[PDB]
Structure 1
Amino acid sequence: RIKKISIEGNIAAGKSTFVNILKQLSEDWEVVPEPVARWSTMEQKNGGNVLQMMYEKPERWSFTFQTYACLSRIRAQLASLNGKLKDAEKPVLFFERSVYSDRYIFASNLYESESMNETEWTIYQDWHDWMNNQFQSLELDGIIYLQATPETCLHRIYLRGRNEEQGIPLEYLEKLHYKHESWLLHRTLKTNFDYLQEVPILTLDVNEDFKDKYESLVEKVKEFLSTL
């Protein structure tokens, strides 16, 4: 009876910020943060290690990293359905990214950049396809695309304060942005989960700094939710 809405958007688009803003604005409203952002305790010590290796050597470590990331996401999102919103009136949980951006943006990207050979890729896909066919549970009631140019998205990357991330190209973001535009806006991308061809989507221009001014976003957020 909880509505599930994934917030999607290229690295540094403004998600962790928007999802936090939104948390403060209702008791029916809860977030699930991104675990690799938690990495970015048994899981922390492990994601901690693989993400570092992800950087140090990506073609050895990408499979291992995509599989754990997804496992941790699924684990974290299930923990949220229990821990919250048992009582509330119109409960909403805002997932920070989804199992679907795990496969069709990041892992895909890694494959296309040759960080996963075909066996790793078809093994991951099998792994992903089977696992999530077991579960309607985490299935998304809707999506909010938080759209931000790599121009915007590089301009935003600098500020955050993280030793591990400071080096990331722009061309990279143009693959993800492209991967993001094709799935969420241009709406072409094929997926093996059919309902992703018909889940309600909302695209919000997150270009302007929305930290000191966000009401307009939230209205469309609220107006979007009153339709699902």
Structure 2
Amino acid sequence: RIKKISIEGNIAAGKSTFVNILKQLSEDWEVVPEPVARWSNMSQKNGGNVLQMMYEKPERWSFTFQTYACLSRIRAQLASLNGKLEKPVLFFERSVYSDRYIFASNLYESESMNETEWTIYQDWHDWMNNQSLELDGIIYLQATPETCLHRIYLRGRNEEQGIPLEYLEKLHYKHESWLLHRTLKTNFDYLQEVPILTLDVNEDFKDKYESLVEKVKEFLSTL
């Protein structure tokens, strides 16, 4: 019996950092890192190609990217149900919900996907998933768009130095509608009541992470 937890947060808030932190702390704790972040500096080929494209001309490629990136996530968390794990916990790096209600939905609103692409994507999504990876909990790593902005700066990936404060602000608002106010409605009945834990990570924690983690073990003890 493996519990599944999704760790969520904006570009550069500290997800793979944190995710690599609890990694080391438990033999019963495994993580699945988001394939998009690894393409991000032969699936690596396809993955590498589509990301630069996506940046250069989102209005052309958001639909091919979002489907490929989401397919990539389903097969990764699947191959992890196997892999490992007495008191198992699987941490996901972001989820198939993130894909759709944060990134895909955002590109429609931005018009980089038209009604047709969005409507198709929505039922591919709806369908692709009805056919196991339901989550037991959600951890929300909360940071302001300016913290993420400088942390994209401490990361120094080429492509992301472009990314402007306004796109981060945009994504922040959607994480807050979804994970705090629980304002957003989904087409997945259960994700209206998945328990959620919200961690504030504006303060660095790379070597001052004990409370965060005590908070994690608590919430985990209450599932």
Is the TM value for this pair above 0.5? yes
- Assess, with a 3 A threshold, how the Cα gap between structure 1 residues 220 and 59 changes in structure 2: closer, same or farther: same
Counterpart of 1:126 in 2: which secondary structure?
Answer: helix
Question: Structure 1 CA distance, aligned partners of 2:194 and 2:133?
Answer: 13
d(CA) in 1 for partners of 2:162 and 2:41? 27
Cα displacement string for residues 138-182 of structure 1 (whole angstroms, at most 9, x for unaligned residues): 110100000000021112110113122111111111110000000
Distance in 1, matches of 2:100 and 2:41, equals 26
> Which sections of structure 1, spanning at least 5 residues, go unmatched?
none
> Paired residue for 2:83?
83
1:210 Cα deviation after fit: 0.3
Q: Deviations over 1:44-91 (max 9, x none)?
A: 100100110001111000000000000000000000111111xxx210
- Distance in 2, Cα, partners of 1:146 & 1:11: 11
Within 1, Cα distance between the matches of 2:199 and 2:189? 24
User: Are the aligned partners of 2:5 and 2:135 in contact in 1 as well (CA < 8 Å)?
Assistant: yes
Compared with structure 1, are the counterparts of its residues 207 and 119 closer, same or farther at alpha carbon in structure 2 (3 Å cutoff)?
same
TM-score normalised to the size of structure 1?
0.96
3-state SS in 1 of match to 2:79: helix
Is the CA contact (8 Å cut-off) linking 2:141 and 2:199 kept in structure 1?
A: yes
Q: State the percentage of identical aligned residues.
A: 99
User: Displacement, 1:41?
Assistant: 14
Is 2:57 aligned against 1:60? Answer: no
The answer to whether the aligner puts 1:209 opposite 2:190 as a matched pair is no
**Distance across 2 between alignment mates of 1:186 and 1:173:** 18
Deviation at 1:42, TM superposition (A): 2.3
Q: Whole-Å Cα distance in 2 between the matches of residues 226 and 206 of structure 1?
A: 22
CA–CA separation in structure 1 for the residues paired with 2:28 and 2:207: 24
- Root-mean-square deviation (Å): 1.3
How many residue pairs get matched?
223
CA contact (8 A) 2:14 2:141 kept: yes
Q: Does 1:153 align with 2:143?
A: no
Say which of 119, 138, 141 aligns to 1:143: 138
Alpha-carbon distance between aligned partners in 2 of 1:183 and 1:41, rounded to the nearest angstrom: 29
Residues in 2 aligned to 1:41 and 1:168: alpha-carbon distance in whole angstroms: 15
Q: Whole-Å Cα distance in 1 between the matches of residues 84 and 41 of structure 2? A: 22
Residues 170-202 of structure 1: CA deviation (Å, up to 9, x unaligned): 111111000000000011101100101100000
Deviations 1:12-50 (A, max 9, x none): 110000000010000000010010111009211001001
Counterparts of 1:105-120 in structure 2 under 5 Å? 105-120=102-117
Structure 2 CA distance for partners of 1:9 and 1:41, relative to 1, 3 Å: closer
Contact residue 41 and residue 157 of structure 2 kept, 8 A = no
- Separation (CA, whole Å) in 1 of partners of 2:169 and 2:38: 25
Q: Distance in 1 between matches of 2:219 and 2:193?
A: 15
> Are the counterparts in 1 of residues 177 and 184 from structure 2 also a CA contact under 8 Å?
yes
